[PDB]
């Protein structure tokens, strides 16, 4: 028992970031976004407290799928009933519910604690190019990642 | 020499073994005899020779 910082709940200020998605693949967008929300890129970790930030996503959508996988990465859902596998999606989710792409391929990237739920509700994914959240003054990142 | 200060001759009165009295004495759970077989039953061992 000696001196290292263990941050409290209301010590670390949060921010608001804006990220485009024009022709970047899924894995690297999701990787940088999921490393934002735990509180990395800030020297004041805990593994207890939400030290992360808020992330808004524009232009869901215009995300690439490199080479093929336009018709290939079949998702799967099962409904706990006999024979109930529903492979209803494909790369079709680019067209419709492009919210639903990034809300799966980021939820996989996170832990599955209770912090993997309080750190998931800070995403906002919009397929268009509009902030309804302009009341909160968000900033812009630059991805060379 | 008197009654309340007795001293024995050194190295000349040993203690005992009390066998089967706890696992960390060294001789508990089969008492220095080991696993099954007729040397470890009640009064086992063949006759001499």
């Amino acid at each position: 028992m000696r001196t290292t910082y263990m941050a409290k709940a209301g010590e670390v200020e949060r921010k608001w970031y804006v990220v485009d998605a024009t022709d970047v693949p899924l894995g690297r967008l999701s990787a940088v976004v999921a490393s934002v929300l735990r509180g990395k890129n800030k020297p004041t970790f805990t593994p207890h407290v939400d030290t992360g930030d808020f992330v808004i996503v524009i232009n869901a959508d215009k995300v690439k799928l490199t080479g093929k996988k336009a018709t290939d990465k079949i998702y799967y859902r099962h409904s706990m009933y006999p024979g109930g596998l529903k492979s209803v999606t494909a790369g079709e989710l680019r067209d419709k519910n492009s919210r639903r792409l990034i809300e799966t391929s980021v939820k996989g990237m996170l832990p599955k604690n209770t912090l993997g739920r309080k750190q998931f509700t800070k995403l906002n994914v919009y397929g268009g190019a509009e902030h309804p959240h302009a009341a909160q003054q968000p900033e812009v990142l630059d991805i060379t990642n | 020499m008197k009654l309340h200060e007795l001293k024995p001759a050194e190295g000349s009165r040993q203690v005992r073994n009390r066998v089967g009295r706890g696992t960390s004495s060294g001789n508990g759970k089969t008492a220095g005899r080991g696993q099954k077989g007729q040397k470890a039953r009640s009064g086992g061992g063949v006759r001499l020779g």
Binding site: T3 | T23, S24, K29
Partner: protein, 102 residues
């Protein structure tokens, strides 16, 4: 006023007018202790630590010689027969601090 001082295997942050709980030092109570290896001097103009920044003597005095609580370290191995039993209680020396470089 920072000072980062090698004491034993460990490194310690040091200010003026506090106590540090360090290992044994072979010195009677209390008397004077002069630590020698000083990496950093902080504050305003940081004396960056080349190893043994020269002319850096950190002085101090001693309050007690005491011990931590016991550490019951029992080992066992299941479905076999084993008991090792110990208890360990290290000695500790408080260290008051005086007079970083001036």
């Amino acid at each position: 006023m920072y000072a980062i001082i090698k004491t034993g295997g460990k490194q310690v942050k040091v200010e003026v007018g506090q106590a540090i709980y360090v290992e044994k030092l072979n010195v009677e109570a209390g008397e004077k202790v002069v630590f020698d290896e000083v990496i950093l001097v902080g504050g305003e103009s940081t004396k960056v630590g080349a190893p043994t920044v020269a002319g850096a003597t950190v002085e101090g005095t001693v309050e007690k010689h005491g011990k931590q609580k016991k550490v019951v370290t029992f080992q066992y191995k299941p479905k076999k027969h084993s008991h090792r039993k110990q208890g360990h209680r290290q000695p500790y020396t408080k260290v008051m601090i005086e007079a970083i470089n001036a």
